[PDB]
Amino acid sequence: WTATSGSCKGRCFELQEVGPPDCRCDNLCKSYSSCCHDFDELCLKTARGWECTKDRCGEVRNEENACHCSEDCLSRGDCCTNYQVVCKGESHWVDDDCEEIKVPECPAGFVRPPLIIFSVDGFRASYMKKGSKVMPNIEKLRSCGTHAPYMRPVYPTKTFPNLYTLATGLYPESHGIVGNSMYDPVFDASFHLRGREKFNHRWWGGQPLWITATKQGVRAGTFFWSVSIPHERRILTILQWLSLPDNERPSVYAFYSEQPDFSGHKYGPFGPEMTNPLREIDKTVGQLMDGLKQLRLHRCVNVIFVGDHGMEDVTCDRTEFLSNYLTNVDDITLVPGTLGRIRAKSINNSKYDPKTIIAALTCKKPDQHFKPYMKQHLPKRLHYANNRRIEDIHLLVDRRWHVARKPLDVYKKCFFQGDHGFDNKVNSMQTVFVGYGPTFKYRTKVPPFENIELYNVMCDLLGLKPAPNNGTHGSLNHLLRTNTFRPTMPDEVSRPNYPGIMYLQSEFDLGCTCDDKVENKLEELNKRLHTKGSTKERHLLYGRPAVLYRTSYDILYHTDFESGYSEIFLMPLWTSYTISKQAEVSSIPEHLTNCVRPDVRVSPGFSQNCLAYKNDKQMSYGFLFPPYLSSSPEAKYDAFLVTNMVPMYPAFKRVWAYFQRVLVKKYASERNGVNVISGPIFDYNYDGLRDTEDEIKQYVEGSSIPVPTHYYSIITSCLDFTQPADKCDGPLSVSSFILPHRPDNDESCNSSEDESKWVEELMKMHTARVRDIEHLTGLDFYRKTSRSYSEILTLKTYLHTYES
Ligand SMILES: *[C@@H]1O[C@H](CO)[C@@H](O[C@@H]2O[C@H](CO)[C@@H](O[C@H]3O[C@H](CO[C@H]4O[C@H](CO)[C@@H](O)[C@H](O[C@H]5O[C@H](CO)[C@@H](O)[C@H](O)[C@@H]5O[C@H]5O[C@H](CO)[C@@H](O)[C@H](O)[C@@H]5O)[C@@H]4O)[C@@H](O)[C@H](O[C@H]4O[C@H](CO)[C@@H](O)[C@H](O)[C@@H]4O[C@H]4O[C@H](CO)[C@@H](O)[C@H](O)[C@@H]4O)[C@@H]3O)[C@H](O)[C@H]2NC(C)=O)[C@H](O)[C@H]1NC(C)=O
Ligand SMILES: CC(C)(C)c1ccc(/C=C2\SC(N3CCCC3)=NC2=O)cc1
Ligand SMILES: CC(C)(C)c1ccc(/C=C2\SC(N3CCCC3)=NC2=O)cc1
Ligand SMILES: [Ca+2]
Ligand SMILES: [Cl-]
Ligand SMILES: [Zn+2]
C-alpha cells in the first residue's frame, strides 16, 4: 500500500527515494506502483515530440512541452537535444571530425570527468561491424575512442547475471544472481524475472558500483528506469541532472536499452527486422552526444558503450526433451532453456538419485545437443558451482538449441527466433565494449577481455577504490590514458629449500623398482651441474613461481625440467620445462616401463611410494615432466623419480599420455618451441581456490598421498613466433587448461575411439586463464620477465577460446 496524496511538482526524477506511504517521483516509482498522482502529468510530458523544428526557435516557453526550444532552455538545462543544431546553426556531434581529447575540458565546478554508462541488452558483438552502416554515432564512438573487437560475458550468458556482474566485478556464483530464475533452499524462496520477490535485497551479494560510489562520496544518478519511461525521456533526465548545482549533481550515470535484445528474441540475431532497432539505439546515442555538446560536456564526460551478452539463432524445433531420456520425468524440477538445472521435485523423496539421472542423460543419442554435468565437473573457466542456488546437476546446451522437460512445456506454457544463455566462449554470445572520453585512449583497439574486469575500470574512472572482486586490477590499464591503478607484484610467502644429496638408496622402503643400474669425470661433473641448476635458465623462463601461502617445499633441478616439490602434498606444486621446435619425441624403453626411482634429495617420509598404487586398484600414476620428451637416455631416468610422480586414474592417463606424447611436440612445432608448467590442483569444495590440507576428500588408498581434482598446464611461447620460446625479446603468448581428474571419460562421448579423435576436444573445452590456475594453486607466475607488470596481468587474464 501507498498513500499517493503528495505531489511531484518540482520533484520530477528526484535523486533520493522517499519513505512510504508518501508517494515517489523517482525514475523507478512505476515499477513499485508508487508514483504520485501527477507523475505522468508533470514528469512524463510528451507534447510536441523530442526534437526542435525550425519554426520552434525562440518560442515562448510552454511548460507542457516534453523539451523546449525557447531562448532560456540552455539556462534551465532542458533544451531538446537538437536545439543548437536547428536553432543556433550548430552541427551534430556525429558530423564533427573527432579530435583527440588529451585533457578533460570541463565547465567550472566539475571536480572530475563524469562517467555515463550506456548499456545495451543483447547487443551481439558482430553488430558493430555488420550494422556499422546504420549506426553512425556508435561507429564514431568506436573508431575514435577505445574499443575491443568483443567483450566476453559471464556464464550463464543471461541478462540479470551479466548486468550484475558488470555492476560488481563478481562471478555470478559470488554475487548470487546465478540465473534469471533461482531457488534458494536456505531461504526457501524463489527468485523470478517477473515478480516482486526479486526486490528483496538478500538475493544481491557483493557491492555494486552505485553503492561503491555512494559510500566514497561520489554521487550517483539513479541507474534504473521503469520500462514505460521512453528512451528520449531517459536521456533528457540525464542531461537535466548534469545541469544540477555542483553540490547536488551526480558524477556517474547509467542509461539502459532493452533493445536490441527485445527484437532479437522475436526475429533472430540478424533478422531483417533487426536493422531498425540498431538505428534507434544509434539515434539515442546521437541525442546523448548532442546533448552533451550543448552543455559543453562532450570533451569532458567519459562514455562507456557496453552490452551484457549476445544473441543466437534458436527456434522451437531445436529443443531436446528430458522426457525422451528419463522415465521419472515427473520427479525432477527443470530450469529450462539455453541451460539446464535439475533438482528433486520433493525433498521427502530419498528414492531420487542424481547419479542415475546423469547416467540416463549421458551420450544417449548420437546427435545429442546437451551434455550433463555435476556442477563441480563443469569447466573451471565458467566459475559456476559455488552457490547453493546452483543445482548440483547442470546441462550445458549446444548453441542454437534449447532443453525442456516435456513437449507440453513448449507448445502450451513458434514465437521466438533468438536466445542467449549458452557457454560464454560461444561467439554469438560475445558482446561489445567501447570507451570514449578524456580518460580513455584515442583511436585504440584493445584485445578482447572479460566483463568481470570493467568494475575496476569504472572505479578507476571515478577515483573509487573497488570492493573486492574477481577482476585483476591493472589488467585493463592499457584502455586508459591516465588514472591507471599501478599494481605491484604480491610478495612471496614461502621461500623454498634447495636440498642436496642427503639420503642413501637403502633408506627408502617405497616398494619401487627400476632397472637403472647401468653405469667419466667429464660427464659425471656435467650431471652434477644439472642437479645444481646449470640448465635452469633454459627450462624456467619467467622465474620460479612464487608461493603465496605458508608451506614447505623444495626446488628440484634436473637436466630437462625443474620443479617445486611440496613436502605437504608429496608431489610437485609445479613442474617447468621447455620443449624447443627441434626437440624429438622418444618412447619409454621396454625395460623402464614400471621404473620408479627414489629421489636421494627428499626423505622417505616426504615421498610417495609404489605400494599404495599397487594396492589402490582404482588409482594409477603418471608423471608431470613426460619421459617421452627426455633429451637423452641418461636424462630419461630423471623423469622416473618418485618426486615427478602424481596420482592418475587410468582413464585420465589416456588423456594425459596423449597430451604429453603428441600435443606438446605439436605445440612446440607450431609455436617455435613452448615452455610448459604443469601441476596438480585440489579444489574439492569447488570454490575456485586452492584447498588446504584438511579439505582433501580423497587419498591414494592407504596413504597420505592426496588425489588432485584437476591437472593444469600453462603453455607459453613467443608472440612473435619467428623467435624461439627460450629466446623471446617481446610479448608472450599463452594458452592453458585445467583438466578435470576424473575416473572415467564419460564427458567424451567418442572416448572409445583413438585419443586423436577426442582428447584435444576435451582440452579445448577446459581451456583456462593463467589467473584461474593462480586462484586454484596459490602460485604467482611470470615473476621475472622483461615485460611491464600490467602487460603480464593482461597475459594472465587471457583465455584461448578456439573459436573461429
Ligand atoms: C571472487 O571474488 C570474491 C570477492 O572477493 C571472492 O569471494 C570471497 O571469498 C572469501 C573466501 O571464500 C570470503 O571471505 C569470508 O567470507 C565469510 C563471510 O563473509 C561475509 O562478509 C562479506 C563481506 O561483506 C559478504 O560479501 C559475504 O556474503 C556472502 O554470503 C551472502 C549470503 O550468505 C551472499 O549474499 C554473498 O554474495 C556472499 O556469498 C558468496 O560467498 C560466500 C562466502 O562468504 C559463499 O559461501 C556463497 O556460496 C557465495 O558464493 C559474507 O556475508 C567469512 O565468515 C569467512 O571466514 C571463514 O573462513 C576464514 C578463513 O580464514 C576463517 O578465518 C573463519 O574461521 C571463517 O570460518 C567460519 O566458517 C566455517 C565454515 O562456515 C566454520 O567451520 C568456522 O567455525 C567459522 O565459524 C571468509 O573469511 C568472502 O566473503 C567472499 N566474498 C564474496 C563477495 O563472495 C571469491 O573467492 C573470488 N573467486 C575467485 C574464483 O577468485
Ligand atoms: C539486473 C540489474 C538491473 C543490474 C539490477 C536489478 C535489481 C537490483 C536490485 C538490488 S541490488 C541491492 N543491493 C546491492 C547490495 C546491497 C543491496 N538491492 C536490490 O534490491 C540490482 C540490479
Ligand atoms: C552497466 C550497469 C552500470 C551495471 C547498469 C546500468 C543500468 C542498468 C539499468 C537497467 S537494467 C533493466 N532491466 C534489465 C531487465 C529488464 C529491465 N532496467 C534498467 O533500467 C543496468 C546495469
Ligand atoms: Ca577450494
Ligand atoms: Cl535461467
Ligand atoms: Zn534476452
From Swiss-Prot:
Inhibited by vanadate. Inhibited by micromolar levels of bile salts, such as tauroursodeoxycholate. Not inhibited by taurodeoxycholate. Not inhibited by hydroxysterols, such as 7-hydroxycholesterol, testosterone, dexamethasone and prednisolone. Inhibited by EDTA and EGTA. It comes from Rattus norvegicus. 1-tetradecanoyl-sn-glycerol 3-phosphate binds at T159, N180, D261, H420. This is Autotaxin. 1-hexadecanoyl-sn-glycero-3-phosphate binds at T159, N180, D261, H420. A motif (Cell attachment site) lies at residues 76-78. 1-(9Z-octadecenoyl)-sn-glycero-3-phosphate binds at T159, N180, D261, H420. The active site is at T159 (nucleophile). The gene is Enpp2. The record marks K796 as: Essential for catalytic activity.
